[PDB]
From Swiss-Prot, chains A, B:
EC number assigned by the record: 3.5.2.3
Note: Present with 12700 molecules/cell in log phase SD medium.
Cited Gene3D superfamilies: Metal-dependent hydrolases (3.20.20.140)
Induction: By N-carbamoyl-L-aspartate.
Protein name listed in UniProt: Dihydroorotase
């Protein structure tokens, strides 16, 4: 009977794919309790053109008229400063997402994070247009050479100097280290923000997923359903992520990285697709964590206030003014989420009970 | 063509299952270049009785008359010291294998390695009969009682105190740390053997697989076919394992832990079976490593002399005197190993090339 008014919830890291998969998952954004979604661009082929980002958003708006969609480009050599200015002036994108080549789904067309200088004309134009630079901050793996080996466990830590250099060279660019998974990165974000007093001072933030608040290496060792990028790491990393999430600091906010794959793309003996599907119960998953940490009073900031502030979402842009209301009615996560045709997805924590449910209230 | 006479090769950690899988796999020990095989006991039900170990070996000899089979008991709750004496006097077993409960394939009937004391009567009986104690040295995972958590990454290291205590309390017992995967374990095996001048001084040895000389956590993160227990760990660990393998030291020798699973037991979204199948090309896999390390002169020790010496294999036990001849005829590993009815196995490094082949010549 207990209720929590979360206002206009934000999930600032969403994958919704194309085709029938997109038709299945895009309505689940609302169902999971999320009013505003930042849409990632790693389609096959990636979103690097204006007409395609415009059509994609309209496709999503058609599937979910009440959901507010913030769009992005895929960082590529095909981008030009002129296209960035055009797209921004037309309100076609709110940011550009960087995938290092080879580290995750549809990242083959991505960048080498040692030569970020080649994209400085893009970053310079983004800075002028007040667009957000989103980073999948992992260095590609390297096991030889003069230098310390890079592997799936330290690839995020190895990326942190690139983050600092970018922030140094573009001090007015808004940058997000997406889905932080390590204690090292959490401290780097806090240290970057030492001189910050009010939320609007934040230039560099980090998003935290639902699943990295629960998972450890043991949970995906032998369970491809829990396998994602960046990989879930050690218990002390999980502890640092949970403390960051409930900290009340304005530079940590929710981005699910809900990444749907059909079940047959997870049940492979080689080349398992990375990604965990959390859209259907996004806010209830987070509520579980905030309850367990006795920190429900900080929930609204993490899943609403801080993301709205960082992305500067105006009320004149929101597709619906309905507020997400959390109510303490227990539910069971289904075993599968299916369109009743050719697509079955295994949802995060399939079979488990959640203490909270979410509904929508006008006004 | 370059040739090396490896003599009577031994693989001191072999899984051959039962039924049709056994019929497929047991002839491959020889085909893979191995003369002597130590047969692990984690069948359903585990091998804990005298008649079953006898019938099993007799089944294996029918399938491969020229292979020398050294047999084992599963360390289990219904095993007794008398059975240890009876089994040894009949030469029905050469050792007893310990599985910590829940840690790997068919280990549900295994032990709690925090309280080994209930098995000390077994160990004392093993000590008198000069039997080998084989250890899957991993402590089961714990994420609760805030003493340190242990997970798939540190579970081997967390077992190392248990190994030392067992060695201390039974100084005349031959003990093997099977399939070592971490630098920590290598150092501990070295420390225990600080004062050994010749092979017959070795009481505590360590076995090394083929796959852990190639694999890193990066190789199995998205590839269940490369998932095994203990998991392949970091580049620094693999570097320690490779160095140990080619070191020429008598306390390191080859044990493949070739662990066959049908392909559908690897292509799961959860509950992927742990194990890598290396039997078909066991010796050629190892040769590759020794060539790349410019240490082919140490190959014979690693795959023959040291295992024969530690297990004290006599010419009177050997099923065939044929010698394994390694010859540098390049070959390609197939994509599948199949019996042509219900069983397909994905071999280690499937599709790759090896510099060497193996053949058999009479003495
Ligand atoms: Zn990502
Ligand atoms: Zn993502
Ligand atoms: Zn084992
Ligand atoms: Zn084994």
């Amino acid at each position: 009977v207990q209720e929590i008014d979360l206002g206009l919830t934000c999930d600032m890291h969403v994958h919704v794919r194309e085709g029938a998969m997109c038709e299945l998952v895009t309505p689940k954004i609302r169902d999971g309790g999320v009013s505003i979604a930042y849409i990632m661009p790693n389609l096959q082929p990636p979103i690097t053109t204006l007409d395609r980002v415009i059509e994609y958003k309209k496709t999503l708006q058609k599937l979910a008229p009440k959901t507010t969609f913030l769009m992005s480009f895929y960082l590529s050599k095909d981008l030009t400063p002129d296209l960035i200015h055009e797209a921004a002036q037309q309100h076609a994108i709110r940011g550009v997402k960087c995938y290092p080549a080879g580290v995750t789904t549809n990242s083959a067309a991505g960048v080498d994070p040692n030569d970020f200088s080649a994209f400085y004309p893009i970053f310079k134009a983004m800075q002028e247009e007040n667009l957000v630079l989103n980073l999948h901050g992992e260095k590609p793996s390297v096991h030889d050479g003069d230098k310390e080996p890079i592997h799936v466990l330290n690839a995020e830590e190895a990326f942190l100097p690139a983050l600092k250099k970018l922030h140094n060279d573009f001090p007015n660019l808004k940058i997000i280290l997406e889905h932080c998974t390590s204690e090292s990165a959490i401290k780097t974000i806090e240290d970057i923000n030492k001189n910050v007093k009010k939320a609007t001072d934040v230039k560099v933030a980090a998003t935290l997923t639902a699943h990295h608040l629960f998972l450890t290496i043991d949970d995906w060792a032998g369970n491809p359903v829990n396998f994602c990028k960046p990989v879930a790491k050690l218990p002390n990393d999980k502890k640092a992520l949970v403390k960051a999430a409930v900290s009340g600091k304005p530079y940590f906010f929710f981005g699910s990285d809900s990444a749907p794959h059909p079940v047959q793309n997870k049940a492979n003996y080689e080349g398992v697709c990375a990604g965990v599907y959390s859209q259907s119960f996004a806010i209830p998953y987070i509520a579980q964590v905030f309850e367990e940490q006795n920190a429900l009073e900080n929930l609204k900031g993490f899943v609403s206030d801080f993301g709205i502030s960082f992305y500067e979402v105006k009320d004149s842009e929101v597709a619906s003014s309905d507020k997400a209301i959390l109510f303490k009615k227990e539910q069971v996560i289904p075993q599968v989420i299916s369109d009743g045709k050719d697509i079955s997805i295994i949802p995060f924590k399939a079979g488990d009970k959640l203490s909270w449910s979410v509904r929508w209230e006008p006004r």
